[PDB]
Design an enzyme around this catalytic site. Structure first.
Site, PDB file in Angstrom:
ATOM      1  N   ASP A 194      -8.881  -1.697   6.368  1.00 27.93           N
ATOM      2  CA  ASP A 194      -8.527  -2.473   5.188  1.00 27.93           C
ATOM      3  C   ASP A 194      -9.759  -3.091   4.542  1.00 27.93           C
ATOM      4  O   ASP A 194     -10.002  -4.290   4.655  1.00 27.93           O
ATOM      5  CB  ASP A 194      -7.524  -3.563   5.567  1.00 27.93           C
ATOM      6  CG  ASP A 194      -6.908  -4.236   4.355  1.00 27.93           C
ATOM      7  OD1 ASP A 194      -7.029  -3.687   3.235  1.00 27.93           O
ATOM      8  OD2 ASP A 194      -6.287  -5.308   4.527  1.00 27.93           O
ATOM      9  N   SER A 246      -5.510 -12.824   0.503  1.00 28.03           N
ATOM     10  CA  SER A 246      -6.013 -11.509   0.881  1.00 28.03           C
ATOM     11  C   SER A 246      -7.269 -11.110   0.119  1.00 28.03           C
ATOM     12  O   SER A 246      -7.406 -11.401  -1.067  1.00 28.03           O
ATOM     13  CB  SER A 246      -4.926 -10.450   0.674  1.00 28.03           C
ATOM     14  OG  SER A 246      -3.822 -10.676   1.540  1.00 28.03           O
ATOM     15  N   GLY A 247      -8.186 -10.445   0.814  1.00 25.34           N
ATOM     16  CA  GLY A 247      -9.415  -9.997   0.185  1.00 25.34           C
ATOM     17  C   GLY A 247     -10.549 -11.006   0.248  1.00 25.34           C
ATOM     18  O   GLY A 247     -11.711 -10.643   0.090  1.00 25.34           O
ATOM     19  N   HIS A 293      -6.011  -3.119   0.512  1.00 25.79           N
ATOM     20  CA  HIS A 293      -4.654  -3.294   0.004  1.00 25.79           C
ATOM     21  C   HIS A 293      -4.554  -4.153  -1.249  1.00 25.79           C
ATOM     22  O   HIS A 293      -3.454  -4.436  -1.723  1.00 25.79           O
ATOM     23  CB  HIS A 293      -3.698  -3.829   1.091  1.00 25.79           C
ATOM     24  CG  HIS A 293      -3.806  -5.301   1.349  1.00 25.79           C
ATOM     25  ND1 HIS A 293      -4.722  -5.840   2.228  1.00 25.79           N
ATOM     26  CD2 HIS A 293      -3.076  -6.344   0.880  1.00 25.79           C
ATOM     27  CE1 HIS A 293      -4.550  -7.149   2.293  1.00 25.79           C
ATOM     28  NE2 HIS A 293      -3.557  -7.480   1.485  1.00 25.79           N
TER      29      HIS A 293
HETATM   30  C1  NAG Z   1      -1.198  -7.016 -10.256  1.00 22.54           C
HETATM   31  O1  NAG Z   1      -1.928  -6.498  -9.129  1.00 22.54           O
HETATM   32  C2  NAG Z   1      -1.291  -6.787  -7.856  1.00 22.54           C
HETATM   33  C3  NAG Z   1      -2.153  -6.152  -6.776  1.00 22.54           C
HETATM   34  O2  NAG Z   1      -1.626  -4.902  -6.351  1.00 22.54           O
HETATM   35  C4  NAG Z   1       0.152  -6.253  -7.827  1.00 22.54           C
HETATM   36  O3  NAG Z   1       0.789  -6.680  -6.632  1.00 22.54           O
HETATM   37  C5  NAG Z   1       0.937  -6.750  -9.047  1.00 22.54           C
HETATM   38  O4  NAG Z   1       2.240  -6.180  -9.057  1.00 22.54           O
HETATM   39  C6  NAG Z   1       0.170  -6.347 -10.309  1.00 22.54           C
HETATM   40  N1  NAG Z   1       0.889  -6.711 -11.517  1.00 22.54           N
HETATM   41  C7  NAG Z   1       0.938  -5.853 -12.535  1.00 22.54           C
HETATM   42  C8  NAG Z   1       1.430  -6.377 -13.874  1.00 22.54           C
HETATM   43  O5  NAG Z   1       0.596  -4.672 -12.430  1.00 22.54           O
END
Ligand code: NAG
Length: 234
Positions: free
Chosen positions: A86, A180-181, A41
């Protein structure tokens, strides 16, 4: 991480930080020169990985940045159920060499044992309700609990998910938003992946849920060997 203290500068050489234009959002574990393991995730369309990081403001001189060359998710995964398999494997665009603050942590060689003492770490929130992200990773010691504990605390937790239950009965120490991770280290071994928990963080009856890494070692090794076709345990 809640209820912990700043981790030692030299105890997390294998901890990887996942980030994109918005900053850190997940952790990961370097298992060898070219591979990183994290939660499924945590996957995103555009992100990078920073290795050898401790403070986000005072940089270690041996920090390294890497991009995801290849991503591996269980072929038999329901992409709607977060608790379902996951786990995600990432092959780095370029290999990493050992340095002061960088070194891999091997896959577990034995299954976890309930009651065992485990350590959690991450740049996740250090406050249970409101979100407070530290500039340094925090660490805390917890225990591997009987699976029945998490089962009673989470109706969504199906017995088929291969997970671990970790925390402390009196509460107060737990992973939180942003961890997470990251790895769950028990008896010095990489036994789990921060996957799921509740909010606020640190409730005694709702311990953390971690992906059982041992159960996937076969699938991981087969992907690393070049099969990239192998399926995950059901
Ligand atoms: C960065 O990655 C995280 C992981 O999914 C996400 O929640 C977040 O919205 C992302 N931000 C952008 C700028 O894409």
């Amino acid at each position: 991480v809640i209820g912990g203290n700043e981790c030692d500068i030299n105890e997390h050489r294998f901890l990887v930080a996942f980030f994109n234009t918005t900053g850190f959002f997940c952790g990961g574990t370097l298992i060898n020169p070219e591979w990183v393991v994290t939660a499924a995730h945590c996957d995103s369309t555009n992100f990078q990985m920073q290795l050898g990081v401790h403070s986000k403001k005072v940089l270690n001189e041996d920090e390294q940045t890497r991009n995801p060359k290849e991503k591996f998710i269980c072929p038999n995964k329901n992409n709607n159920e977060v608790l379902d398999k996951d786990i995600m494997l990432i092959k780095l665009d370029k290999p990493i060499s050992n340095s002061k603050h960088i070194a891999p942590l091997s896959l577990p060689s034995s299954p976890p044992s309930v009651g065992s003492v485990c350590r959690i770490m991450g740049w996740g929130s250090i406050t249970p309700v409101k979100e407070t992200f530290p500039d340094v990773p925090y660490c805390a010691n917890i225990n591997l609990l009987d699976h029945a504990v998490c089962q009673a605390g989470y109706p969504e937790l199906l017995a088929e998910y291969r997970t671990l239950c970790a925390g402390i009965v009196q509460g107060g120490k737990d992973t939180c938003g942003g961890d997470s991770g990251g790895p769950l280290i028990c008896n010095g071994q990489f036994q789990g992946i921060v996957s799921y928990g509740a909010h606020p963080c640190g409730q005694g009856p709702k311990p953390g849920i971690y992906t059982n890494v041992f159960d996937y070692t076969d699938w991981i090794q087969r992907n690393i060997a070049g099969n990239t076709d192998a399926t995950c345990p059901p």
